[PDB]
Amino acid sequence: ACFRMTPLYNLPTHRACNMFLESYKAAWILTEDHSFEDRMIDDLSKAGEQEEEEEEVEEKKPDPLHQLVLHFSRTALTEKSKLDEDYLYMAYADIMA
Amino acid sequence: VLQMISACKGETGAMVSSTLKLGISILNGGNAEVQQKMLDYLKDKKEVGFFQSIQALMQTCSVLDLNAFERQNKAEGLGMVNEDGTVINRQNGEKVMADDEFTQDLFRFLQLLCEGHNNDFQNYLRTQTGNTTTINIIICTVDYLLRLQESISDFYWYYSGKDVIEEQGKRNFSKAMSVAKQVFNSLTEYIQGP
Amino acid sequence: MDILELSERLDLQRFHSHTLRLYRAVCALGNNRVAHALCSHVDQAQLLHALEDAHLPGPLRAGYYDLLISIHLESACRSRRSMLSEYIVPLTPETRAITLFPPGRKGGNARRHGLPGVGVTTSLRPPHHFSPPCFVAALPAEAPARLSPAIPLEALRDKALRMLGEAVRDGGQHARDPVGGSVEFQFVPVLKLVSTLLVMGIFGDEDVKQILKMIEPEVFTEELEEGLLQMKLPESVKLQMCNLLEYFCDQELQHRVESLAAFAERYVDKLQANQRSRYALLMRAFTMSAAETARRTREFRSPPQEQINMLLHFKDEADEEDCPLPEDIRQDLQDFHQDLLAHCGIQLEKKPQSLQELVSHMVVRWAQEDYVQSPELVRAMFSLLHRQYDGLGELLRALPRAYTISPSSVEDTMSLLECLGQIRSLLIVQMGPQEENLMIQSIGNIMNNKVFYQHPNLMRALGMHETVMEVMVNVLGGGETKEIRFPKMVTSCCRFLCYFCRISRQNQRSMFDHLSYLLENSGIGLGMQGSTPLDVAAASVIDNNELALALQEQDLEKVVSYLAGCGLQSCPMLLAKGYPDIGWNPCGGERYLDFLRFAVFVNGESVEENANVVVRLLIRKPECFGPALRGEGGSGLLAAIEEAIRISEDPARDGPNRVHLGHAIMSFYAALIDLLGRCAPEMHLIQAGKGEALRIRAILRSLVPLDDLVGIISLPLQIPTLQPKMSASFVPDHKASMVLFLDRVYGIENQDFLL
Amino acid sequence: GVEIETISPGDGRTFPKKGQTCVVHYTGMLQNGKKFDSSRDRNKPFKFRIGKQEVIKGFEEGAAQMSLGQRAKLTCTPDVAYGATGHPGVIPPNATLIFDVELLNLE
Amino acid sequence: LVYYEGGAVCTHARSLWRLEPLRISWSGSHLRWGQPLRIRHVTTGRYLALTEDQGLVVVDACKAHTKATSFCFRVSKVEGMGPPEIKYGESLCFVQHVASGLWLTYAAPDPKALRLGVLKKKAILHQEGHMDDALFLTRCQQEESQAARMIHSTAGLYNQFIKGLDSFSGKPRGSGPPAGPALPIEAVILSLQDLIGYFEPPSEELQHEEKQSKLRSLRNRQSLFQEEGMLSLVLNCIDRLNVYTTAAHFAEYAGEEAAESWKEIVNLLYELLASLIRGNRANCALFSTNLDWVVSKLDRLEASSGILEVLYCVLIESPEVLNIIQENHIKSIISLLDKHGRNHKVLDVLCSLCVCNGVAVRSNQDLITENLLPGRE
């Protein structure tokens, strides 16, 4: 087969575009944004309890991260047979690591 | 993380893989304080719920199979489809192990639990007081480092009559031996700190 | 009595409150038949009159908004929402001009993101269809139970926005008696209507530029009325705000992929033109140096996709460059890729002045000033800021659903896209005899559209093979064989799956992965014709030559266990016709074994690894063999078939399948030896230079004596004369299964060929 | 049998013929007094073609006997309009239908 | 008869056994090798014995005169607490009859049909036995053990009530002498009032963790009361009681002193059955065959709260029973609204006939539109 493999210059324009996008997964998959990792837990969680709070008695209002984890604990305790996918859990599990 | 693993009984899907990856990051080094919190909860909830998962999960781990190796050795003979972007899978490594990126972390998680010569996990893993039943992870891990040993020795006979090991005969081989080293590290950390 | 006084009864209101809940419940997940019958019952006018009304008991008329949204909409919203994930785009002149706000001047290149959602999208979406109610029309006896109810969309759009204009002004003014009773009744039912009308895109250009003005200070003023995101709100309307903000994220995403398509057009055009210039420079003209011909190899060799990799690698790479292009077309990427990695999230080292800053700075405030209950809420906003903090992550997870096509074919695809929607609505509804009819024409019209033959990559991106798969599993889900309700549709659909599997190699792989799933619910419902899920299971690997190597044993092991069943059962469904059913059923066995034939060889007597384990596994269960032979009583090598011959011309014995029973017995044993003639060790390439394959050859040769086998090729029934025979008895056409059984097992040698 | 009782007078010379459209701003009722249809709550007049069997038999034999601008009251017997099974959800089976038809324009 | 079973009955009350030593004092002391003892089945309330020829038969508590039972433990083939020897899960004790000196093992005579059919084996006291007994013990002493004696007590108190009730099935009273043996009424009323409290659903103000924990401890016990009957039993009582129609006046020929205590007994069963069905899913599937029976009545002047609630809880969990209504059950419940007034509870039930969890059915989502909707009364 290797001699009849048509040249590139005879392909229809519509088809010669889909191959470009699928092949051009060589500028995102290798580039790194970093960014959301260290600035995430910095602005979120820490410094969450700002001067907005006016008074307290015995306890303290949970900071924004504290709501997040307990939610995963909340859904974990739900009486079910098998855990679902919940890709949202994957998105935050990795960035916490 | 203990609550998340307990919910997933014995299915090694993407759930626990992304969860066990987290647990390594909290308790790297020694981290004595985080170990104390985990022990207190297990003594408080006093349900089994979790050691069933660990015992069942590691029994589903794979070893160095040989029959699957032959399936690669002829599938790799082909180089490209008639005309479709050549072999898209290329490496398609999922066969011999397809788990080393995961099964190497399960044992590391256990080893890091008994770090710093902590003499409560090193005793708790042997027998769970109270509760209803015990699991004894200690004897439950040595059995794995016997089936794997029977696999490498096996692999040796397949190459006993040859003279040079081809490139794909070493890439898979080094994968298995790296796993065996990680298991050996754990066994020491149940004994260190007598 | 007047409706307005039901606010002071508290018992008659409670009954009527549930009444309008029944009407919401009667209009099930698409029931255009009975939906219109409610129109004569409830109204067409006082619903439109309930909007402006202010005196409101609460759980009453405020609940009518949930009935207006149920008898006129979600007949397309429930479908158009599924349409929002794939981003098919055609080659159009309008598409040729799309960028990051190109009326920007200097600063506008790195700023002026543009208001989210203006127009020009060129995406392919089916249009809404509506019909007016008329109960004086002639008695019908086409459209599925009917098309849809109608309504003046023009009046609703203007009225809704004007109504919400009062809400923002009234909320700031404050009062001790809000519309409906307590603030949230004045907000949640009215802006929920706004959200549903927004996804259909009834609003256009000017209209959406005003809904953004409800959060004026930041988003508006591209060139008093405090924004909706300024005041404290209860824990219910905040959820709806998330449902509104969520619609705007993908609008930017839909704008994002179109920009790539715009760049995916002009840059590929010059690339093809410049590559031809590269040809004639090194074409027949050529020069010298010999080895230069070795260097120019991508240009004629390698598949076209391989060429793209070589020519695109160095463009967006760093430092090292190999086989480069002219340093004139390699500059726009370093600008476009720079331009792209300045819009989404990249810093590339007050007033938000951007949606990204607005959402991120706002969601944090909501958590810092409240402990949010209702877990359904907290899951909402946490899915937002993750998207606004990982821009490329969403993009990277969106391209595998994007596809470009050419004009003069959009009309053909438009019919396919609209027709495919009805299948998606079929999954949610339970199977009905009227609905069963609908799909058969639906799938029948799918396989004529001229587009499900040219672009298979679409159909795996839309993935209708996924959706149609659940259609089969629901109907077949049952305790035993008695649950064969709704036949004639599994056959009508399984035929479509087989042809899908015979269009491309990647199509074969994509459905192959469900082989274990398919066989789990395949060997139960046996007895019909045309097709069965077992057939498409067999067709999943017929000529791959590498899929056969990618089996997992357990699949082959479990199908064998099925064959153990048909060696001791009696076929009670076959028995139900009042048939002998002596010891076992050959009908079932002939189907399982036909599958195994396609997993022992792929192309001309090859692949033995799976073949080797088949014989070593099949021997373990001796009951797999028909009890006529390979047993303890007797074997009857030339007698078992002869016994079948005796029953062949015995109409009394038979069953007093659809033809006779002796043919079924002949079909079994002939097919079994056909399996163990191609499950032979190998050709003499291995049998003459090794000692492993000889072990298998000894085994199979020891189970079929040659003395009986040679004699079996004899006694043909008759020939038509004077009046042909019938295909109900033991024929002779299917006796060639014993020819290949001796051609590659014992083989010719001495001079026995004469005998 | 269609009983046409007049309500308001009309022109008296222009009557509908075959193949011709009519606009009719009707409102239908039952014998008990319960309204089941109206074409004035929608503010969209009903338009139909005479002779092509769009409307029921009682409606067109009712609209053919009137003049332009005339408003009459029909009493359609259940034999000529939805006899046995009826229209499910709107009209009960074996029910008498009353129509207050008014022809606005074009015969 | 005694059998063996895998990981199916291991979470069931059938496989629970109680050990009763022969002494009266220090019976709770540590158990040691070489000590005679008896074996009792908890829910059956019977011992195990081999009398003369019938085999290892589960004998009652009246023919167990310390010679037929006579069991003890052997390693291989005291006025105090005593020495603790036998452990949990690894003691590997061997069972042996004392008088006969035999060893217990499985006969396991399996034909072709038995091998592929019932996975059940029979145990016999063979003279030499097999080599694979290794009977080790597991401890289950928790809330479920308390809810084991309850089955025997309630099931032994119910059937005696029906059996006594069944005697006067068709005999009009010879006014004066009411009947023969009397009937218990105060006992059952207290008994039923306990289980409804015992099966009372989890509260609302409790937090998630405590609510979820008890939610697991309620579903199990609801299923545990089905495998030992007690669904047929409560069904059986309704069949016998519901024969007496009208009021206590027709029930007069059963003892007029118990007539005035008729309404509450009829009532109390119904919400008891609702407790056994509400929430749980497996039990709801049982009513598919009995759907016609429950929907039948819907008319007794003292059943209104009971029947509308039991029907409400079986159409909220199982969509299977939802598919077994043809044309007449719908108009029956429709007529209920026509005879018992304007009740929002019934209208809510009709919403259940509509879309189920996710999936919607159209075979019946038109009948209500054509039956309760066209008429405007």
Residue numbers in the entry:
A (entry chain A): 3634 to 3730
B (entry chain A): 3779 to 3972
C (entry chain A): 1648 to 1788, 1793 to 1874, 1922 to 2047, 2089 to 2395, 2414 to 2479, 2487 to 2519
D (entry chain E): 1 to 107
E (entry chain A): 244 to 320, 331 to 630
Task: Quote the study's own text.
Because anthranilic acid diamide is more potent against this resistant RyR and CHL is more soluble than TET, we used a high concentration of CHL to saturate its binding to chiRyR-I4657M/G4819E and solved the corresponding cryo-EM structure. This allowed us to visualize the binding site at a local resolution of ~3.2 Å. Compared with the unbound structure of chiRyR-I4657M/G4819E, the binding of CHL did not significantly change the conformation of Met4657 but induced an ~90-degree rotation of the side chain of Glu4819 toward the cytosol to avoid the steric hindrance. Based on our complex structure, which shows that CHL binds to the resistance mutant pocket in a different conformation but also disrupts the S1-S3-S4 interaction, future designs should focus on achieving shape and charge complementarity with the resistance mutant pockets to enhance affinity over CHL.
The molecular target of diamide insecticides is the ryanodine receptor (RyR), a large ion channel expressed in the membranes of the sarcoplasmic and endoplasmic reticulum (SR and ER). Therefore, we designed a series of insect-like chimeric RyRs that contain the diamide-binding pocket from Sf RyR and the remaining parts from rabbit RyR1 (rRyR1).
